[PDB]
Design a protein around this ligand. Structure first.
Ligand SMILES: [K+]
Ligand SMILES: [K+]
Length: 303
């Protein structure tokens, strides 16, 4: 089962999940084994803190249960790592708002820009009217790219001159969305990390301004991070969550990277729902995150 996701995770399965089998084959449970397992988790970008938790719980379980053969650790690991992901399994529900406002935050990159377009296309296929707000106002090339994408797909894009106030662009976009019976408004934001304090004050202003039109907006603050960036995804998540309240995460580029293990660090450290994972280039390859499918694909050795 889950053959498509197994293929997407092929490189990650070399070190995690089914990748544990060859590590445990024929070994005894002792300090040396747990040291090697810890190293393998860290090499897979699970992160120091999440790895320490896994090792602590696995060591105590094996000791209390008086396990002797390392092979038995496979099942315990599947349970422990499966629970990490199940705790952040909650799909995004955009129904019933006028409009439902998604504030897209994260650092500038192919991930965030592509995710906006894929989500917009998916929502349209679901029968919803979509509008985009070009809130990354100082990057003229990014704004035009979004306007061009909107014209190619007949989706309206709200934009102002280069250097306009991002909070004003998004405010005007919400007003236009309400006036035009839009179901979902997706607002892009700046993603420059050179001046951390400036970006976070900018995001806080965007959120405050929205409340004049709808106290419930933004209905979702979605972070986009790239699994191929390893621990940079974790530090980016920490920065954006501490400044603005994240309510969902999209993790892109899980396919073809040996760093897929970072999903466990993101899930464990922040406890924010992972709404979507990107496992391919098609629109539909931005798929709703299902923790059970993911863990089964990761740990199953069959195809
Ligand atoms: K992508
Ligand atoms: K055009």
């Amino acid at each position: 089962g889950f053959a498509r996701l197994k293929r997407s995770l092929l490189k990650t399965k070399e070190n995690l999940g089914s990748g544990f089998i060859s590590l445990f084959r024929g070994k005894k449970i002792d300090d040396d084994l747990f040291e090697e397992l810890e190293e393998q988790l860290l090499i897979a970008d699970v992160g120091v803190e999440t790895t320490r938790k896994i090792i602590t719980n696995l060591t105590e379980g094996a000791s209390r249960k008086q396990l002797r053969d390392a092979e038995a650790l496979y099942g315990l690991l599947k349970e422990e790592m499966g629970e990490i992901l199940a705790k952040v399994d909650e799909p995004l529900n955009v129904e019933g708002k006028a409009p439902f406002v998604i504030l897209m935050v994260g650092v500038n990159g192919v991930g965030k820009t592509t995710t906006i377009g894929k989500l917009a296309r998916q929502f349209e296929q679901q029968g919803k009217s979509v509008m985009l707000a070009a809130g990354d106002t100082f990057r003229a090339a990014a704004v035009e790219q979004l306007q061009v994408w909107g014209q190619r797909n007949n989706i309206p894009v709200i934009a102002q001159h280069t250097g306009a106030d991002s909070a004003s662009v998004i405010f005007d976009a919400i007003q236009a969305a309400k006036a035009r019976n839009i179901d979902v408004l997706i607002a892009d934001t700046a993603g420059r990390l050179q001046n951390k304090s400036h970006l976070m004050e900018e995001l806080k202003k965007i959120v405050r301004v929205m409340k004049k039109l709808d106290v419930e907006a933004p209905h979702e603050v979605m972070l986009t991070i790239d699994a191929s960036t390893g621990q940079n995804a974790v530090s980016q998540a920490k920065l954006f969550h501490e400044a603005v309240g994240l309510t969902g995460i999209t993790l892109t580029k899980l396919d073809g990277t040996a760093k897929g293990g970072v999903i466990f660090s993101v899930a464990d450290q922040f406890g924010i729902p992972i709404r979507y994972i990107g496992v391919g280039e098609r629109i539909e390859d931005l798929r709703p995150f299902k923790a059970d499918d993911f863990i089964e694909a990761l740990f199953a050795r069959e195809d």
